[model samples]
Target: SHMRILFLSYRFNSLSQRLYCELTEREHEVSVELDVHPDLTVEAAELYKPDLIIAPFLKRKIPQEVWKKYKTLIIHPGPPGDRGPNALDWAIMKGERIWGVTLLEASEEYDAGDVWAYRTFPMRFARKASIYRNEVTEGVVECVLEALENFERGDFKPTPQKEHWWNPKMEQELRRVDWEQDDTKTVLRKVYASDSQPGASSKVLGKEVLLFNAYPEEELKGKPGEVLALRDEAVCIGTRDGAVWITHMRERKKESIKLPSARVLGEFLKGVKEDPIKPWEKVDFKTYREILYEEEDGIGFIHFNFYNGAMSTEQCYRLLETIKYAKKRPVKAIVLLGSEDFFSNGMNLNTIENAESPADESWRNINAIDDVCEEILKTPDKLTVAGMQGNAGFGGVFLALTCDLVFAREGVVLNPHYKNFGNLYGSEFWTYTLPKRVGWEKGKEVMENRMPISSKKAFEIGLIDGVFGKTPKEFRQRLKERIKNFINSKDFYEFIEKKKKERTSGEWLEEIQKCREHELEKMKLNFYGFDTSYHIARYYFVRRKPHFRTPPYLAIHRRLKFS
Candidate 1:
């Protein structure tokens, strides 16, 4: 049975955001409130009168008054015995082989409350952001559904927490990497623990900085702390036993921005040798890989897991090269399986902000991404499919539309419009792709709507071809099977012929080019226009400006009209 659930979250992060989509898709009436203030939270509860409350990613305690009056559950990123604000970070730093997500009831003492449900998962060696976005989010989804089912049945008992181990907020001191003593793995753990936040404190080129996007190296050896090599904008620094690549860094300055590690340490790394690899090269050891190509069962999959889905100009070019390489493979179909957390978020704002001329970089970045989309659009013989296992926004949404078929995992959020970032008139050939999929009027409506669209809505509106699977793992399995079937279908050749006719026709090609030209012309103004809205928005966004108030689009309660 569906429950009227009001999600109280610190912010509508990946976990809370996905839960909203999932519950709404399950036909439950879901409302949201940011934990901006306790009074506001209590007011929202009183107004919505939800059957239950879920704090998917809250930073503070639910107001005592509200919790005492109504049932509330806090989704903690820890196991039953573990308790802490930095649970995921500690687990990763400690190299805990197993970790879990606990759906515990709100009580006087945070995380000391009774448990409704919990799910343990094997830990992967990845950044805290990655683990949280993928494993933690999936586990929480399962726990939330189970807890809701139990609550609806009114037969299950909430178990009191038997074990408790409180962990304090992770401070930068504990996250500091010791280059001389720490091995590659140890160094990586420290960096991963603090990533996507106050990154592991470290010094590069005599300037204090925070490190992120770490990857272990196998063969490289040098004096500890030495800059071993540079490749693809990432720099390899020597550890005690081996080396590791740090892809990004943020200077220890109040106003500094996180950017490519090489760029951050540009002056120091000027003499370091560049160790470039082929887009299709199969390396035997671990390294920072942004773009990769794999072939199996007559299907070629191009994967570009850019951090936070922000594709810089170089990354876009690299992805384009990989796609071009994959297209040459002897495969019936090529699937673009973007990362599990995000397919792509269009342009790299951090890189653009770090540039001498943000406008020039933005221009180059858009053109680079457009090249990739054009490549996908121009492909005709082999089937090109976009398997979006995660959320996509702006140009990323249209990047998928360029394919012959586009599919997304269930509950994945898609922000198809670019109106939010100071009314970004986006490129990436969205003009041609969006209208092609859903027609002109619907496309116009979507562009004007400054809100997130669930994969279900996208499917209903013909923005995506299909939406299935509850988790990334499940989605990948089903997608593989579906692709295999499509490749083996009797009409596969006929389908390819149809695609060829449509893609190669002179009139259609001319129309596509005209749309691209029109879109880029508008985007050029957004980049270099007299109105500096885009540039101003990008500056604050890249700097991680805190939200003063929730947008009316998300805070539905605020938008409710009174008589």
Candidate 2:
């Protein structure tokens, strides 16, 4: 029993052509209706008197009369549970790796139909909007053909949708990039989603531009939305979570061009007019010794002892400067040694709270430190170490991670107390480093949960390289022995030499600086409220004293954090 099929499509893209060809090949009684206006949907259905009406990527809504007359089937380019105008865009924005094409019996209410069949496809490494469109076109064709075949053989069964495939709000503003969220993967998805259709757009230098292509940056600092790097091939920009490299772009009224080409059109809009203050430029370091020699001797050492003094931005700057200077020197191994009972209790939280504009200052300081870490990782150094004896929290822990190796005393604690301060930082480091050290799943779990782990637990999760005994004396002795053993290894020097050859210091520095600027801009946009001070004031109060006792107060603060 051959069925009469009427294909309804809006714009005749590749999917439309393919469907038309497939239906004709099947020798079914098929008629193609291109660009069926929303008003004529019912009129066309009544005139055709077809048993099934197939719509592949149709934009207009079908009237109730059409559904009453014929069993309308829609080839939705998304999973059964994922349906909306821009489903692929939403999926990409949300960082979904897998999506599907759903073939379902259409109802009067768009997409909320009975599911007939679905075909899932991998979206990994398919970031370009063009690629997504191609995949969806082919995927929808296959799904439609399968549904048609199943219906002809009387094998297809309609599964009534239990719930709306997606929420209405979810589809409204799916492509916009939110610079406040520090999730690199999510940001990447948003960039991907923004490809081609509307194109990911941001107002830079007061001009609206579309972002087409971008890559992830492992380390980022400053503020988000800052133009970090503008080259011929791409323009690197900072986001709250990480850095985004847009290789292709289109300026308002200008044709789509390569990012570098766009830069040529106009001086690529930088978020800020001037370069950010460098860590070394602001900090004073007299007591700390900078290492500068390349050596076969395996021992690498960094000792910082600020006796009874709370950590400050200056301390962070100095530590990073020491690391930067140390990279120039050759050493098989290096260790950062802190004073007795004081690895670092992190930045002085009380001091930060008392500052004139603590939140803004804090963001700047953290971003600066992040820039230093970017420099460290990009350096041509090898097997750098941080040997901790006492407590290491927040900035202290982040500083420790800058090294390739970290050794903490048994009872040493690690915490990211930024959340406690009603703020957050170093998320880009977490995004890049965690996945490399641990697997993606574990990294995601740790970050999302924001749970503090002990040194032992840290070691277990591969967050820390090693842990030593509880006593300071014992810890120092162990660290010494380890450093000595590392120095004695011939292979260590060879590894360092190899790494040095592979590393590009100039390129990385340029990138990091650019990233920092972008980050700074994002911070301004987010904390300064893009123009409204209400949110900024609210954020200040939330950061000053998070109300833990009262549920309503806590809830309000949470909302403020997002706002």
Candidate 3:
């Protein structure tokens, strides 16, 4: 018999969404309580009467009354012996090579409960956002399943954790920087820890500026905290030994939103050297790179590692240029390995928000990304593959759909519909591509519902070509292996030969314009016309303004809003 599970989470993030997806697929009844308040949690427990309680992510303590009697499993992003509140933050700051996600029996003390299961991973020298979304999230899923099975067997004993130091709540002070004392590596470590939001706050040019999207600039040097250069909304700042580029920032008084350094540092960046990007033909993946290329055997891999998968106008332009360069190569196949945390979420809203004309920028950004999509769609010389090793949303979902073949990690969630952002008439050629693959009726329902589906479901609906891999790394490794057999297969020749005909002078030639015209017709209404929903939606999104909602803890379990 399947167990009835209860999920007590704060917000349904990628991890919790994945866990719910798994549990429900296993035929277990699952529900959620956003509130972790002592009274509400107890009330939820009494009402739901779950056989098992799993808390993947929580902000406050679970009431003693609930955990004291029940089999509550808590997923902590720390090793077995580690005890902490800011486990991931401290982990990144300390630069630990190996970190873990632990499943413990929830008890009186937080993160000090009896251990159930744990798994460690090789840390990717990436921002905390990427690491949590990729490695930590991956391990949590693994550890939770194992812990659940162990509970059923009743053969293993839960062991007590070693006495360890508790992490005080991570504050701005603990994340402070001393420019004169810290090297580029040290600055990057701290910066990455709080990356993508509420960045490492520090004084810059005698004013407080929060730092994020940092990468060490090896060749550039100056006195500590000096502005070396600025380009692509990224500002390069000096350190004791070397330098790093700070991409996005927010001022101390106004912490509501984090915007591009170019936007935040608008007039302050007049004299800084804004280097040209053309000099770096191929990007270095080790540092913060917008795009990187590598070739293995007969397959070519071009990685576009955008931060949070949000492609700005300039980033989209850069991608178009990079692909055209890759077109010059002699590879038989090409794979698009997107960033670890996100394959792509499409268009940069922040840059658009800061533009002189928001609607104009939106038009430019959408059309810019379309050029990238068309580049892949029209490539006849090689087989194109979109590798979604992470979650994808909105236009990004359609961007991947444009490839000749698309595959995703099994755990990856896909938000293929743009209806979430005020009934957006998205334009990555989706109007034609989606209906072509899944038919008009199915595509209509998928978008109208604004549902989030697993890659497995996407493949079933023929929206994707294939789905495999448990973890992002595993999924990526499997993709390469599949490519090898595909390149060497009997169908490979027939596929590419057929590919050339379809892309060059086949029926697709006519359909391409037909789709573009239809999509643009609707997008014009979204951009130039009177419907203010799209503009109104993006404004709140860029500003990080909260939508109307109950308290986080009191929020009902929303099955699809994860990510």
Candidate 4:
């Protein structure tokens, strides 16, 4: 049965966005309200007159006055046996390989309601944000579907809780780490426990700084808690047994915001007496590095693991160099494996927010990434393949399409539009790449719909070449075998020769050049024109304002109907 569904969440984050899209696709009338106050919720519930209310992501519990009267289902990150806002934190800190998502009736007591549905997945060893993007989001969608199906059928039986108790909140102070006494693994656990938000309270250079974006440093030795090296806008500090690279940090001071580690404290970092990693060659990552390359069995893979896959100007320049290095190698095919959790999110907003001039930095950042897209589009000798194991959005989606053949793992979401980041027009040579792949009408839908498409849907619609593997672990394993079979196949010879011709004798190079020119002309206006919509959207995005509501494009039910 098609029913009216009202969504109550603190913000329209990725998790909420996915559920909204999924429910709407089922022909259910769906609307969302970011308002959290009980009175506001009551007013919204009355106005929308939804058959049910679903809170996918909420910081505050729903009031008893509302939950008592209406059938409300709250999506919980933990299993039915778990109860807490710190569910993911506990799972990560405790190193649980298996975790679950639960759907329960919203009751007076938080997370103490009758369980409707639940689904579990094997957790990857990553921070909360990384886990949330892949496993948690994937699990939540599965459980939500099961719960909704039962509701539609009027066959759902919610099992009452056994009065299970848990710490509803994980205090930041409790996440404190003793850098001098902790090994790399231990220190990483402390950081990953609070990866994207409310970062771990830790010491950096013997000063108070909340730590985030940690990576292991297998080499470099020094006294525990001592600075070891600095590279790729991150700093390396010695641990009890080994060292770990802190990629980002912010002083635990009043009015301070999180910034890239080196830039925020570049003065203190300058005293480390070690140069950053070189760009001309591949980094061994003994300390810190963003780009790396390796060759095996006539195939070379160039990996660029930027933080959250947001590539800043410097990061893009470094990656362009790395691609150039890979081009020099005598390999038949080059696989472009981006960051595990994000193939690429395109331009780095945080870096731009901290720049001296936002407009100039935005311009520089876009152009730098544009060079990267062109490099992949015009790779002459080798057949280039893009491996997207995680979500890719905005320009990142277009960047992936630039490859000769793009393959995304199952559960991956691709948002190939730009209007969400304000009315700004994006440039990734998408004007050239998208139309060539899917034709003009489909291209418009891909770029204007501003919705997430699963990897299967993407492949079905010809957005990506193939969708492989059900899990990230399986994806990585299958990625190798798939690429091997392709490179060694007879068709690969035809592709490389055709690709080489397109770059040389054919008009493909000229065709793409005209497209780049056309995109930049419009992009210049969006970046510098009188309108400040892009600036406002990006500002709110970086400041993490909680009041932003879900856009009407994604909330079709809330949209006004034309007479």
Winning model by lDDT: 1
Q: Model 1, 271-380: lDDT tens per residue?
A: 89999877577888887677778788889988887888899999999899888888888999999988888888899999999999999999999999999999988888
Clashing pairs in 1: none
TM-score of each: 0.92, 0.42, 0.86, 0.93
- Candidate 4 lDDT at 499 equals 74
Name the lDDT value of residue 460 in candidate 3.
Answer: 83
**What ordering of candidates by lDDT runs from best to worst?**
1, 4, 3, 2
Q: Best candidate per TM-score, number?
A: 4
For each candidate, the alpha-carbon lDDT, in order, equals 0.86, 0.59, 0.80, 0.81
Error of 1 at 264 (Å): 0.8
- RMSD over all Cα atoms, model 4: 2.6
Write down the lDDT that model 4 would get.
0.81
Q: Name the regions of candidate 3 deviating beyond 4 angstroms.
A: 36-49, 63-71, 122-125, 150-162, 277-288, 295-299, 448-451, 468-478, 484-490, 524-563
Tens digits of per-residue lDDT for model 4, 1-563? 89888888887777887776677667887778776466767766766777888999998878777777779999888877798888999888888889888889998777888998888888877899987877788888888888878887886689997756586578877778777778888888989989987788887776888898888888787778887877777888888898888888877875465777887777777667655564335555554667768887677787788887788999889888888877888888888889778888999988888888988999999899999999888887788888998878887888888888899887777788888887667888988888889999998887877666677778989988998887767886787788788888888888788778778855887888888888888888888899878888888778776563445664444457811
Error of 3 at 444 (Å): 3.4
- Between candidates 1 and 3, which one is better according to lDDT? 1
